[PDB]
Every structure is written in C-alpha cells, then in structure tokens.
C-alpha cells in the first residue's frame, strides 16, 4: 500500500550513513535492527534474521543501502496498527478493564517469545506506569508508544 | 484395564444393572474412580491403596483428562488448568453420605495442589499451612459415630487463592454449625471429639499434671457417655503428635496452645461436677471447681453460684435437673465458641500478607466443598435435622447444575434436545425453608416466649400447618407405628429419616444464661475473652443456619463447578465389600443414570458468541484484530478457519455449543501458542519506541 517517497529515500539515506562506520557505504548485519528502529520502524527479531539471512549469504556480515532500502520498504508494507497492539495487550488483560499489573506485565514480557531482559522491562514499566501504583493502563501506553 | 473408564462409553447405557456391574467390577480390581462425562464417581475402598503418592501426581499434572485413566488428581489438574487458562473462580463440589470419603477426598486434592503447583517468590509456604489445618480441625471437629470412625461434625468450604503465576498465595475457610451436643453427650458407640482423647493418651506428664487431668478417659463423664473410649482404626497418641506439630505450622504460639489446652481441660472438669442437695442444689466436690478457676481464669465463687443460681431482681437457687442443664449449656458454649475462634485463628494464618498489588485483583480462588453428609441413626434429633437439611439444599444445587439448568438452556437455544426426566427435591427444600409455611419458620414461631410452647406443642402446630404432605408424615397419618408419637417422619432425597421433636425448642434457641455469660466475660484467659465480651437481636439457630446455606449456595453459583460423587460400599466400613442393595439405592437418588443420559447426548462446553469471539479471535485473520459484523457471523468464519467439523459443534440462538472437550483443548492450545506472537508484537513495538526516546 504505502510506497516510498522521493523525500523518504533521502531521509533513509542520511540516517544510514551514521552507522556507515568504516565508510564503505555499508552497515553491519548486527547493526541492522538499530537503524530501522531509528527510522520509525518496529521490526521483530525474527524479521531481522530473515533480512540478515538473505543478504549475508556472501558472508562479510554487511548490507548496503540499496538492499537496506529494500528491507525498509517491505517492513513498511505491513506494520502493526495501534489497534492490533491494543488488542494484543487486551489478551493478557483478564479483567477486560484495560489494566495489567506491572508484576504481570513484567512476567509475560520476560517469559514469552522474543523475551525482554530484566533491564529492558524495568525501563518499559517506568514510562508505562506513570503513577507508579503498580498498575499500567495499556490503551494509554499504546498511544504513547505508537504515537507519531 | 477393567470395565469402561467412562460410563458414557458404556453400552446398554440405560441399564441400571449394567451400571452397578461396572462399579463392582472395577471396585474389586481396586479401581475406585470412574467418569460420567466430566463428573467423577468415587467408591470408598475402606483400605489404604496408595494412588496418592507423588509418582501418581506427576502422571496427572499438566495432561488432558481424557488421555489418562480416571483418578481424583485428574479433576484436580483439570480444575487447576481451568483456573489458569481462563481466570475464573473454580469450585470442586463433593457429595456423599457419612463415611463416603468426602473429607479424605478434599485432603488429597489439597496435597496435589501443594506438591504440584509452582512456589511463589516472596510468597510464603501456605502450602504447609493449608495441609496442616486438617489435623487441627479434625481433632476439634471430628468424632467417631456409628457411620464414620472419623466424622466431621462441622461443614467446611475452603478457598485457595492463586496468583497470576499459578501459585498459592493463601486461603480462607468457612465453617458451618458445629454439632454442639456432642461435647456434653454421645449415643452409645460414639466418642466425643478426637481432641479430648488425643490429649489424654498423647499429652506429656508435665502438661497433664498442670491441667489436673488423668490419663484414663473413663474418668471423665463427658468423654465416655457412649461407653466407647477407643477406636481400633485410630491411634490417638500419634494424632496428638501430629496436631501439636501442626499448631506450630499454622503459627499458634506455645502460649496459645497452653491456653487452648486450658479450655479443653475445663470442659472435661466441667462435666465431672456433681450436684447434691439442700432442700437447693450445690457442688459437693471441690476438685473440679478448683482447676476450673485456674484454667478458666475466673473467680471460683462467682462460677459456683453461677452454676447453682439463676438471676431473676434477686438470685433463686436451682435443682439437680436445672443445675446440670446450666452446666451443660456452659460446656457447649465454651467449646463451640472456642471452635469458631479456632477457625478464625487458622484463617488469620492462611491469609496472605500483602498491602495492595501487584496486583491482587488478578488472584483467582479454587473452592473446595466439604460438608457433613446425609446420616440416619436409630434416634435422630435436631443435629441430624440440620445436617440432612444441609444435604438437601446442596443436593438441589447439584440437580440445578447437572440436570435442570443444562436442559433448560437447550430449550431457550436452538439446540435439538429430547428432555431427560429427573426427580426434583426442590419440594423437600421448600418443606423446610419456605417462608411462613416452613418447618424452620414454624419452629421459630413456637420459640417466642418460654413456659408456653413445648416439644409436643411444636409438633402439633406442625401437623396443623403442614397438612398431608408427600415428604412429611406423623403418627396422625395412615398406618404407623412403625411411626411413633412425639416424632415426625421426613422423606429426604436419600431416604426417610425419623426425628424426635424432643429437645428441638431448647436446641433451636441457643441459650446461655446471662448468669453464665457474665462469668465468662470475666475470664482472664486470652481465648476466652475473645469468645465472650460485654453483654436484643437473638436470632435462632435454625434461621441463622438457613442464612448460612443460602450464602453458601450463591457463593458456589458464582463459580465454575466440578463434580465429585462419593459412594459408600457398605455399612460395615469393610474393604472389598460391595453391597449391591446399598450402592443401588445411592445411584438411584444421586440420579447417576439420568446423568449418564444427559452426558452422552449433551455438549461439554457452551459460551456466548461475544465471549467466544473476544477470546479466540486472534486465531483467525478475518477476526483479527477486529470484527465489525454480528458476533455469530464472526464465530462462524472463526470456527471454519479453526477446522471444526459440523458434528463437533452447534450454533445456538445466543451461544455456541461444542460437544467434546478435545475440541476446545486443541483450540486453547492454539491460543496458547498465538500468545507467543502477540507478545512479540508488544516487545517489537516497545523496542522500537524505546530506542527512539533515549536517542534522537
Ligand atoms: Mg485487567
């Protein structure tokens, strides 16, 4: 649906060089996810290794702008809507009251697929629970998180 | 490998003769557990065969129930799994006659949860407390009757509370109407509460000396009014060692145990007091009255005249009949109020310690119902009337859930259903608790004012108000004797029981004279000052009890039920003995065959479209994240994507019906894996959002 703009490609080009490192006009695969998140994209780790596995077959663990730009255009075609994130949360909400305990949120995030580190979860709960009462409002948290 | 593990699979399923045969065949091979649908039927082995060890537990935990043989642990793991997937209060309802195995059944369930479920983190071990509560309650609440060597004289409903991780965080117990008279009286062959005998046989030298107690039970009139001080199936010295150890587990301090023992010894001493004469009644021996002041911590003089006098405005003396009656009233009050205290003290121990969150709004309870079962003796009085009425009210709830409700639902729905006929005991329940017109309501009417209505005047208004009723009979109807005078026959779901009306008014009004009440308020004993305080609105025992059961029912209706049906093999408490006449009678009034019919033709699961859709919608792309149409339509496309065969489900008016449990489990196991993906969506969204914040 969404197709790259002429302006958009310029944005992606400038931000891509920051990680250019050596200056080959190349980036490291292990550095791949970071540059996408910096561009507003929310790729999953499994999605990341699929991109790696395609362009890394030559080894060298590197990927250039053209093939990066390809990975960015594909990821932009299907991106979770705010409504899908809220509905995903809603599944871990048993009351249906739109609240989850920080304790329970921490438990699921760390114990369910693509697990966050304890340090990561700490940071998540910090801006997710604003009043620090141990309860997080996820519909409010999702807005802030998907906010443009 | 014997018979059929599930009656639904039984061929010739309409034969009552085939039913009992399967029970008999499995029983002698020592298979005591058998399924009717989700309902588990249990036959008392009356011997110890260990299916309850930790090896057995491991094979039932985390597995589907249709994939493993029938066992009590299955229902345990099924109920615990129900409590996990969907977060809803669950309750295991257990029915049976006296000695059917309800109490042992509840203890086994707990054991499974205690050794099976995961441990909390900062949570404590309430697991040991939940288990150790039984020995303590059995000592004080259980006594040997002719029906059961270990018999619960109190009803029990217990809640276990789980956190969101599935580990026990604590629990709560509710008790119902301890049998009071048992403390001052026993019919021949029966003992008093276990606690008394445990103390005498197991108590240490120094402790019994301090309580002024003799090791020989025959030396206490309250202990042996049944000529029975001993039971071959019971080692009182061992039970005592256990109870003493359990009290520490449930956090009784050594001082509280010495105080409780003081109260226990006082009742023993209390029964040994003899009254002689003046012209009117006074205490001959100083021995009991002595220890009595010390252990009860009251003034020896105020107690003596409290036993020998009555406040009317001066004090008139009493006679040997009245002086002995007041004594018993005190002993009953002291033990009963002490029992109530004991339960609260335990509840104080099981109660989780937390302030608020996280979360504690996410905790769900697992209820376990253990009550006193239907019992009938040669002589039946107020105590049996309460107990048998209790089983009626709960027998109604069983019917309401397993027969009435499920069938009325099909009708309201679009489901094709051929009605199955069942007996409804609702009529019997009304005979008792009906307003104004009811036995309990009448007994209350006669309880207004003293010196006016008697046991015999009560039965009279009973005959007059209840006229030619199917479940009520007296000597004034048809041919009886066998039906005597001063007694009424009531036909329960479990069969007819004859009651004497003598003692009914006195037992319904639970009356302790201000004289004796004041004396107890002056007690320096910590436990006693908690049970007795200060000094209008005197509600009757029967009406208060009626209130309790109503609350108990509405508590159970609000939970997702599991059913265990206990069956007694014989009247002799004998292993390997299968009595066909007895088992038949039970199968008949329990309505097990009428149940087998409903299960064979019925559906294991039903849910409203909206509820079914909100839950499983992530399993289909057309229903995810949202569905804009009618819920039925969403469930329609959703179940097609899920691959339900047309025979596996039925679309009703307001709900979807799924015939077999295997269908829903496979679905719940899919939602289990889908959660992995949904979590990844949140984690990916957070990982993206977080980087953009701490940078840029
Ligand atoms: Mg919630």
CSV table of N, CA, C and O in Angstrom, one decimal, chain B residues 451-555:
chain,number,residue,atom,x,y,z
B,451,UNK,N,-42.0,-21.2,78.7
B,451,UNK,CA,-43.1,-21.7,79.5
B,451,UNK,C,-44.4,-21.8,78.9
B,451,UNK,O,-45.5,-21.8,79.6
B,452,UNK,N,-44.4,-21.8,77.6
B,452,UNK,CA,-45.7,-21.8,76.8
B,452,UNK,C,-45.8,-22.9,75.8
B,452,UNK,O,-46.7,-23.8,75.9
B,453,UNK,N,-44.9,-22.9,74.8
B,453,UNK,CA,-44.8,-24.0,73.8
B,453,UNK,C,-43.8,-25.0,74.3
B,453,UNK,O,-42.8,-24.7,74.8
B,454,UNK,N,-44.2,-26.3,74.0
B,454,UNK,CA,-43.3,-27.4,74.3
B,454,UNK,C,-42.9,-28.2,73.0
B,454,UNK,O,-43.4,-27.9,72.0
B,455,UNK,N,-42.1,-29.2,73.2
B,455,UNK,CA,-41.7,-30.0,72.1
B,455,UNK,C,-43.0,-30.6,71.4
B,455,UNK,O,-43.1,-30.7,70.2
B,456,UNK,N,-43.9,-30.9,72.3
B,456,UNK,CA,-45.2,-31.6,71.8
B,456,UNK,C,-46.2,-30.6,71.2
B,456,UNK,O,-46.9,-30.9,70.3
B,457,UNK,N,-46.1,-29.3,71.6
B,457,UNK,CA,-47.0,-28.3,71.1
B,457,UNK,C,-46.4,-27.9,69.7
B,457,UNK,O,-47.2,-27.5,68.8
B,458,UNK,N,-45.1,-28.0,69.5
B,458,UNK,CA,-44.5,-27.7,68.3
B,458,UNK,C,-44.9,-28.7,67.2
B,458,UNK,O,-45.4,-28.3,66.1
B,459,UNK,N,-44.8,-30.0,67.5
B,459,UNK,CA,-45.2,-31.0,66.6
B,459,UNK,C,-46.7,-30.8,66.2
B,459,UNK,O,-47.1,-31.2,65.1
B,460,UNK,N,-47.5,-30.3,67.2
B,460,UNK,CA,-48.9,-30.1,66.9
B,460,UNK,C,-49.1,-29.1,65.9
B,460,UNK,O,-49.8,-29.4,64.9
B,461,UNK,N,-48.5,-27.9,66.0
B,461,UNK,CA,-48.7,-26.9,65.0
B,461,UNK,C,-48.1,-27.3,63.7
B,461,UNK,O,-48.4,-26.8,62.6
B,462,UNK,N,-47.2,-28.3,63.8
B,462,UNK,CA,-46.5,-28.8,62.6
B,462,UNK,C,-47.5,-29.6,61.8
B,462,UNK,O,-47.7,-29.4,60.6
B,463,UNK,N,-48.3,-30.5,62.5
B,463,UNK,CA,-49.3,-31.3,61.9
B,463,UNK,C,-50.4,-30.4,61.3
B,463,UNK,O,-50.9,-30.6,60.2
B,464,UNK,N,-50.7,-29.3,62.0
B,464,UNK,CA,-51.8,-28.4,61.6
B,464,UNK,C,-51.4,-27.5,60.4
B,464,UNK,O,-52.2,-27.3,59.5
B,465,UNK,N,-50.2,-27.0,60.4
B,465,UNK,CA,-49.7,-26.1,59.3
B,465,UNK,C,-49.3,-26.9,58.1
B,465,UNK,O,-49.6,-26.5,57.0
B,466,UNK,N,-48.6,-28.0,58.3
B,466,UNK,CA,-48.2,-28.9,57.1
B,466,UNK,C,-49.2,-30.0,57.1
B,466,UNK,O,-49.3,-30.9,58.0
B,467,UNK,N,-50.1,-30.0,56.1
B,467,UNK,CA,-51.2,-30.9,56.0
B,467,UNK,C,-51.1,-31.9,54.9
B,467,UNK,O,-50.9,-31.5,53.7
B,468,UNK,N,-51.1,-33.1,55.2
B,468,UNK,CA,-51.0,-34.2,54.2
B,468,UNK,C,-50.0,-33.8,53.1
B,468,UNK,O,-50.3,-33.4,52.0
B,469,UNK,N,-48.7,-33.9,53.5
B,469,UNK,CA,-47.6,-33.5,52.5
B,469,UNK,C,-46.9,-34.8,52.2
B,469,UNK,O,-46.7,-35.7,53.1
B,470,UNK,N,-46.4,-34.9,51.0
B,470,UNK,CA,-45.8,-36.2,50.5
B,470,UNK,C,-44.5,-36.5,51.2
B,470,UNK,O,-44.3,-37.7,51.5
B,471,UNK,N,-43.7,-35.5,51.6
B,471,UNK,CA,-42.4,-35.8,52.2
B,471,UNK,C,-42.5,-35.6,53.8
B,471,UNK,O,-41.5,-35.7,54.4
B,472,UNK,N,-43.7,-35.3,54.3
B,472,UNK,CA,-43.9,-35.2,55.7
B,472,UNK,C,-45.0,-36.1,56.3
B,472,UNK,O,-46.1,-36.2,55.8
B,473,UNK,N,-44.6,-36.8,57.3
B,473,UNK,CA,-45.6,-37.8,58.0
B,473,UNK,C,-45.5,-37.7,59.5
B,473,UNK,O,-44.4,-37.5,60.1
B,474,UNK,N,-46.6,-38.0,60.2
B,474,UNK,CA,-46.6,-38.1,61.6
B,474,UNK,C,-47.6,-39.2,62.0
B,474,UNK,O,-48.2,-39.8,61.1
B,475,UNK,N,-47.7,-39.5,63.3
B,475,UNK,CA,-48.5,-40.6,63.7
B,475,UNK,C,-50.0,-40.4,63.5
B,475,UNK,O,-50.8,-41.3,63.6
B,476,UNK,N,-50.3,-39.2,63.0
B,476,UNK,CA,-51.7,-38.8,62.7
B,476,UNK,C,-52.1,-39.1,61.3
B,476,UNK,O,-53.2,-38.7,60.9
B,477,UNK,N,-51.2,-39.7,60.5
B,477,UNK,CA,-51.5,-40.0,59.1
B,477,UNK,C,-51.2,-41.5,58.8
B,477,UNK,O,-50.2,-42.0,59.1
B,478,UNK,N,-52.2,-42.1,58.2
B,478,UNK,CA,-52.1,-43.5,57.7
B,478,UNK,C,-51.8,-44.5,58.8
B,478,UNK,O,-52.4,-44.5,59.9
B,479,UNK,N,-51.0,-45.5,58.5
B,479,UNK,CA,-50.7,-46.6,59.4
B,479,UNK,C,-49.3,-46.6,60.0
B,479,UNK,O,-48.3,-46.9,59.2
B,480,UNK,N,-49.2,-46.3,61.2
B,480,UNK,CA,-47.9,-46.2,62.0
B,480,UNK,C,-48.3,-46.0,63.4
B,480,UNK,O,-49.3,-45.3,63.7
B,481,UNK,N,-47.6,-46.6,64.4
B,481,UNK,CA,-46.3,-47.3,64.2
B,481,UNK,C,-46.3,-48.2,63.0
B,481,UNK,O,-47.4,-48.8,62.7
B,482,UNK,N,-45.2,-48.4,62.4
B,482,UNK,CA,-43.9,-48.1,62.9
B,482,UNK,C,-43.6,-46.6,63.4
B,482,UNK,O,-42.6,-46.4,64.1
B,483,UNK,N,-44.4,-45.7,62.9
B,483,UNK,CA,-44.2,-44.3,63.2
B,483,UNK,C,-44.7,-44.0,64.6
B,483,UNK,O,-45.9,-44.2,64.9
B,484,UNK,N,-43.8,-43.5,65.5
B,484,UNK,CA,-44.2,-43.3,66.9
B,484,UNK,C,-44.8,-42.0,67.2
B,484,UNK,O,-45.2,-41.3,66.2
B,485,UNK,N,-44.9,-41.6,68.4
B,485,UNK,CA,-45.5,-40.4,68.9
B,485,UNK,C,-44.5,-39.4,69.4
B,485,UNK,O,-43.5,-39.8,70.0
B,486,UNK,N,-44.7,-38.1,69.2
B,486,UNK,CA,-43.7,-37.1,69.6
B,486,UNK,C,-42.6,-37.1,68.6
B,486,UNK,O,-41.5,-36.6,68.9
B,487,UNK,N,-42.9,-37.6,67.4
B,487,UNK,CA,-41.9,-37.6,66.3
B,487,UNK,C,-42.5,-37.5,64.9
B,487,UNK,O,-43.7,-37.8,64.7
B,488,UNK,N,-41.7,-37.0,64.0
B,488,UNK,CA,-42.2,-36.9,62.6
B,488,UNK,C,-41.3,-37.5,61.6
B,488,UNK,O,-40.1,-37.5,61.8
B,489,UNK,N,-41.9,-38.1,60.5
B,489,UNK,CA,-41.1,-38.7,59.5
B,489,UNK,C,-40.9,-37.8,58.3
B,489,UNK,O,-41.9,-37.2,57.9
B,490,UNK,N,-39.7,-37.6,57.9
B,490,UNK,CA,-39.4,-36.8,56.7
B,490,UNK,C,-38.7,-37.6,55.7
B,490,UNK,O,-37.7,-38.3,56.0
B,491,UNK,N,-39.1,-37.6,54.5
B,491,UNK,CA,-38.5,-38.3,53.4
B,491,UNK,C,-37.6,-37.5,52.6
B,491,UNK,O,-38.1,-36.6,51.8
B,492,UNK,N,-36.3,-37.7,52.7
B,492,UNK,CA,-35.3,-36.9,52.0
B,492,UNK,C,-35.0,-37.5,50.7
B,492,UNK,O,-35.5,-38.6,50.3
B,493,UNK,N,-34.1,-36.9,49.9
B,493,UNK,CA,-33.7,-37.4,48.6
B,493,UNK,C,-33.0,-38.8,48.9
B,493,UNK,O,-33.1,-39.7,48.0
B,494,UNK,N,-32.3,-38.9,50.0
B,494,UNK,CA,-31.5,-40.1,50.3
B,494,UNK,C,-32.3,-41.1,51.1
B,494,UNK,O,-31.7,-42.1,51.6
B,495,UNK,N,-33.6,-40.9,51.3
B,495,UNK,CA,-34.5,-41.8,52.0
B,495,UNK,C,-35.0,-41.3,53.3
B,495,UNK,O,-34.5,-40.3,53.8
B,496,UNK,N,-36.0,-41.9,53.9
B,496,UNK,CA,-36.7,-41.5,55.0
B,496,UNK,C,-35.9,-41.5,56.3
B,496,UNK,O,-35.2,-42.5,56.6
B,497,UNK,N,-36.1,-40.5,57.1
B,497,UNK,CA,-35.5,-40.4,58.5
B,497,UNK,C,-36.5,-40.0,59.5
B,497,UNK,O,-37.3,-39.0,59.3
B,498,UNK,N,-36.6,-40.7,60.6
B,498,UNK,CA,-37.5,-40.4,61.7
B,498,UNK,C,-36.8,-39.5,62.8
B,498,UNK,O,-35.7,-39.8,63.2
B,499,UNK,N,-37.4,-38.4,63.1
B,499,UNK,CA,-36.9,-37.4,64.1
B,499,UNK,C,-37.7,-37.3,65.3
B,499,UNK,O,-38.9,-37.3,65.3
B,500,UNK,N,-37.1,-37.3,66.5
B,500,UNK,CA,-37.8,-36.9,67.7
B,500,UNK,C,-37.8,-35.4,67.8
B,500,UNK,O,-36.9,-34.8,67.6
B,501,UNK,N,-39.0,-34.9,68.3
B,501,UNK,CA,-39.2,-33.5,68.4
B,501,UNK,C,-38.7,-33.0,69.8
B,501,UNK,O,-38.6,-31.8,70.0
B,502,UNK,N,-38.3,-33.9,70.6
B,502,UNK,CA,-37.9,-33.6,72.0
B,502,UNK,C,-36.5,-33.0,71.9
B,502,UNK,O,-35.5,-33.5,71.4
B,503,UNK,N,-36.4,-31.8,72.5
B,503,UNK,CA,-35.1,-31.1,72.6
B,503,UNK,C,-35.0,-30.1,71.4
B,503,UNK,O,-34.0,-29.4,71.3
B,504,UNK,N,-36.0,-30.0,70.6
B,504,UNK,CA,-36.0,-29.1,69.4
B,504,UNK,C,-36.0,-27.6,69.8
B,504,UNK,O,-35.3,-26.9,69.2
B,505,UNK,N,-36.9,-27.3,70.7
B,505,UNK,CA,-37.1,-25.9,71.0
B,505,UNK,C,-35.8,-25.4,71.8
B,505,UNK,O,-35.3,-24.3,71.5
B,506,UNK,N,-35.3,-26.2,72.7
B,506,UNK,CA,-34.2,-25.8,73.5
B,506,UNK,C,-32.9,-25.8,72.7
B,506,UNK,O,-32.0,-24.9,72.9
B,507,UNK,N,-32.8,-26.6,71.6
B,507,UNK,CA,-31.7,-26.6,70.8
B,507,UNK,C,-31.7,-25.5,69.7
B,507,UNK,O,-30.7,-25.0,69.2
B,508,UNK,N,-32.9,-25.1,69.3
B,508,UNK,CA,-33.1,-24.1,68.3
B,508,UNK,C,-32.8,-22.7,68.9
B,508,UNK,O,-32.1,-21.9,68.3
B,509,UNK,N,-33.3,-22.4,70.1
B,509,UNK,CA,-32.9,-21.3,70.9
B,509,UNK,C,-31.5,-21.7,71.5
B,509,UNK,O,-31.5,-22.6,72.3
B,510,UNK,N,-30.4,-21.0,71.2
B,510,UNK,CA,-29.2,-21.5,71.7
B,510,UNK,C,-29.0,-20.6,72.9
B,510,UNK,O,-28.6,-19.4,72.7
B,511,UNK,N,-29.4,-21.0,74.1
B,511,UNK,CA,-29.5,-20.0,75.2
B,511,UNK,C,-28.5,-20.2,76.3
B,511,UNK,O,-28.4,-21.2,76.9
B,512,UNK,N,-27.7,-19.2,76.5
B,512,UNK,CA,-26.8,-19.2,77.6
B,512,UNK,C,-27.3,-18.1,78.6
B,512,UNK,O,-27.5,-17.0,78.2
B,513,UNK,N,-27.5,-18.5,79.8
B,513,UNK,CA,-28.0,-17.5,80.8
B,513,UNK,C,-27.0,-16.4,81.0
B,513,UNK,O,-25.8,-16.6,81.0
B,514,UNK,N,-27.6,-15.2,81.2
B,514,UNK,CA,-26.8,-14.0,81.5
B,514,UNK,C,-25.9,-14.3,82.6
B,514,UNK,O,-24.7,-13.9,82.6
B,515,UNK,N,-26.4,-15.1,83.6
B,515,UNK,CA,-25.6,-15.5,84.7
B,515,UNK,C,-24.2,-16.1,84.3
B,515,UNK,O,-23.2,-15.7,84.8
B,516,UNK,N,-24.3,-17.1,83.4
B,516,UNK,CA,-23.1,-17.8,83.0
B,516,UNK,C,-22.3,-17.0,81.9
B,516,UNK,O,-21.1,-17.0,81.9
B,517,UNK,N,-23.0,-16.2,81.1
B,517,UNK,CA,-22.4,-15.4,80.1
B,517,UNK,C,-21.5,-14.3,80.8
B,517,UNK,O,-20.3,-14.1,80.4
B,518,UNK,N,-22.0,-13.7,81.9
B,518,UNK,CA,-21.2,-12.7,82.6
B,518,UNK,C,-19.9,-13.3,83.2
B,518,UNK,O,-18.9,-12.8,83.1
B,519,UNK,N,-20.1,-14.5,83.8
B,519,UNK,CA,-19.0,-15.2,84.4
B,519,UNK,C,-17.9,-15.4,83.4
B,519,UNK,O,-16.7,-15.3,83.7
B,520,UNK,N,-18.2,-15.7,82.1
B,520,UNK,CA,-17.2,-16.0,81.1
B,520,UNK,C,-16.5,-14.7,80.6
B,520,UNK,O,-15.4,-14.7,80.2
B,521,UNK,N,-17.3,-13.6,80.7
B,521,UNK,CA,-16.7,-12.3,80.3
B,521,UNK,C,-15.7,-11.8,81.3
B,521,UNK,O,-14.8,-11.0,80.9
B,522,UNK,N,-15.7,-12.4,82.4
B,522,UNK,CA,-14.7,-12.1,83.5
B,522,UNK,C,-13.5,-13.0,83.4
B,522,UNK,O,-12.5,-12.8,84.2
B,523,UNK,N,-13.4,-13.9,82.4
B,523,UNK,CA,-12.3,-14.8,82.3
B,523,UNK,C,-11.0,-14.0,81.9
B,523,UNK,O,-11.1,-13.0,81.2
B,524,UNK,N,-9.9,-14.4,82.5
B,524,UNK,CA,-8.6,-13.8,82.2
B,524,UNK,C,-7.9,-14.5,81.1
B,524,UNK,O,-6.8,-14.1,80.7
B,525,UNK,N,-8.5,-15.6,80.6
B,525,UNK,CA,-8.0,-16.4,79.5
B,525,UNK,C,-8.1,-15.7,78.2
B,525,UNK,O,-9.2,-15.2,77.9
B,526,UNK,N,-7.0,-15.5,77.5
B,526,UNK,CA,-7.0,-14.7,76.2
B,526,UNK,C,-8.0,-15.2,75.2
B,526,UNK,O,-8.7,-14.4,74.6
B,527,UNK,N,-8.1,-16.6,75.0
B,527,UNK,CA,-9.0,-17.1,74.1
B,527,UNK,C,-10.4,-16.9,74.5
B,527,UNK,O,-11.3,-16.7,73.7
B,528,UNK,N,-10.7,-16.9,75.9
B,528,UNK,CA,-12.0,-16.8,76.4
B,528,UNK,C,-12.5,-15.4,76.3
B,528,UNK,O,-13.7,-15.2,76.1
B,529,UNK,N,-11.6,-14.4,76.5
B,529,UNK,CA,-12.0,-13.0,76.5
B,529,UNK,C,-12.4,-12.6,75.0
B,529,UNK,O,-13.1,-11.6,74.8
B,530,UNK,N,-11.9,-13.4,74.1
B,530,UNK,CA,-12.2,-13.2,72.7
B,530,UNK,C,-13.5,-13.7,72.3
B,530,UNK,O,-14.3,-13.2,71.5
B,531,UNK,N,-13.9,-14.9,72.9
B,531,UNK,CA,-15.2,-15.5,72.6
B,531,UNK,C,-16.3,-14.9,73.4
B,531,UNK,O,-17.5,-14.9,72.9
B,532,UNK,N,-16.1,-14.3,74.6
B,532,UNK,CA,-17.1,-13.7,75.4
B,532,UNK,C,-16.8,-12.2,75.7
B,532,UNK,O,-15.7,-11.9,76.3
B,533,UNK,N,-17.7,-11.3,75.4
B,533,UNK,CA,-17.5,-9.9,75.6
B,533,UNK,C,-18.8,-9.2,76.0
B,533,UNK,O,-19.9,-9.6,75.6
B,534,UNK,N,-18.7,-8.1,76.8
B,534,UNK,CA,-19.8,-7.3,77.2
B,534,UNK,C,-21.1,-8.0,77.6
B,534,UNK,O,-21.0,-8.8,78.6
B,535,UNK,N,-22.2,-7.8,76.9
B,535,UNK,CA,-23.4,-8.4,77.2
B,535,UNK,C,-24.4,-8.5,76.0
B,535,UNK,O,-24.2,-9.4,75.2
B,536,UNK,N,-32.0,-8.6,72.9
B,536,UNK,CA,-31.9,-7.6,71.9
B,536,UNK,C,-32.3,-8.1,70.5
B,536,UNK,O,-33.4,-8.2,70.1
B,537,UNK,N,-31.2,-8.6,69.8
B,537,UNK,CA,-31.5,-9.3,68.5
B,537,UNK,C,-30.9,-10.7,68.4
B,537,UNK,O,-29.9,-11.0,67.7
B,538,UNK,N,-31.5,-11.6,69.2
B,538,UNK,CA,-31.3,-13.1,69.3
B,538,UNK,C,-31.8,-14.0,68.2
B,538,UNK,O,-32.9,-14.4,68.4
B,539,UNK,N,-31.1,-14.1,67.1
B,539,UNK,CA,-31.6,-15.0,66.0
B,539,UNK,C,-31.5,-16.5,66.3
B,539,UNK,O,-30.5,-16.9,66.9
B,540,UNK,N,-32.5,-17.3,65.9
B,540,UNK,CA,-32.5,-18.7,66.2
B,540,UNK,C,-31.4,-19.5,65.4
B,540,UNK,O,-30.9,-19.0,64.4
B,541,UNK,N,-31.0,-20.6,66.0
B,541,UNK,CA,-30.0,-21.5,65.3
B,541,UNK,C,-30.4,-21.9,63.9
B,541,UNK,O,-29.6,-21.9,63.0
B,542,UNK,N,-31.7,-22.3,63.8
B,542,UNK,CA,-32.2,-22.8,62.5
B,542,UNK,C,-32.3,-21.7,61.4
B,542,UNK,O,-31.9,-22.0,60.3
B,543,UNK,N,-32.7,-20.5,61.8
B,543,UNK,CA,-32.8,-19.4,60.9
B,543,UNK,C,-31.4,-18.9,60.5
B,543,UNK,O,-31.2,-18.6,59.3
B,544,UNK,N,-30.5,-18.8,61.5
B,544,UNK,CA,-29.1,-18.4,61.2
B,544,UNK,C,-28.5,-19.4,60.2
B,544,UNK,O,-27.8,-19.0,59.3
B,545,UNK,N,-28.8,-20.7,60.4
B,545,UNK,CA,-28.2,-21.7,59.6
B,545,UNK,C,-28.8,-21.6,58.2
B,545,UNK,O,-28.0,-21.8,57.2
B,546,UNK,N,-30.1,-21.3,58.1
B,546,UNK,CA,-30.7,-21.1,56.8
B,546,UNK,C,-30.0,-20.0,56.0
B,546,UNK,O,-29.8,-20.0,54.8
B,547,UNK,N,-29.6,-18.9,56.8
B,547,UNK,CA,-28.9,-17.8,56.2
B,547,UNK,C,-27.6,-18.3,55.7
B,547,UNK,O,-27.1,-17.9,54.6
B,548,UNK,N,-26.9,-19.1,56.4
B,548,UNK,CA,-25.5,-19.6,56.1
B,548,UNK,C,-25.5,-20.4,54.8
B,548,UNK,O,-24.7,-20.1,53.9
B,549,UNK,N,-26.5,-21.3,54.7
B,549,UNK,CA,-26.6,-22.1,53.5
B,549,UNK,C,-27.0,-21.3,52.2
B,549,UNK,O,-26.5,-21.6,51.1
B,550,UNK,N,-27.8,-20.3,52.4
B,550,UNK,CA,-28.1,-19.5,51.3
B,550,UNK,C,-27.0,-18.8,50.8
B,550,UNK,O,-26.7,-18.7,49.6
B,551,UNK,N,-26.2,-18.2,51.7
B,551,UNK,CA,-25.0,-17.6,51.2
B,551,UNK,C,-24.0,-18.6,50.6
B,551,UNK,O,-23.4,-18.2,49.6
B,552,UNK,N,-23.9,-19.7,51.2
B,552,UNK,CA,-23.0,-20.8,50.6
B,552,UNK,C,-23.4,-21.1,49.2
B,552,UNK,O,-22.5,-21.3,48.3
B,553,UNK,N,-24.7,-21.2,49.0
B,553,UNK,CA,-25.2,-21.6,47.6
B,553,UNK,C,-24.8,-20.5,46.6
B,553,UNK,O,-24.2,-20.8,45.6
B,554,UNK,N,-25.1,-19.3,46.9
B,554,UNK,CA,-24.8,-18.2,46.0
B,554,UNK,C,-23.3,-18.0,45.8
B,554,UNK,O,-22.9,-17.4,44.7
B,555,UNK,N,-22.5,-18.4,46.7
B,555,UNK,CA,-21.1,-18.4,46.6
B,555,UNK,C,-20.7,-19.5,45.5
B,555,UNK,O,-19.8,-19.2,44.7
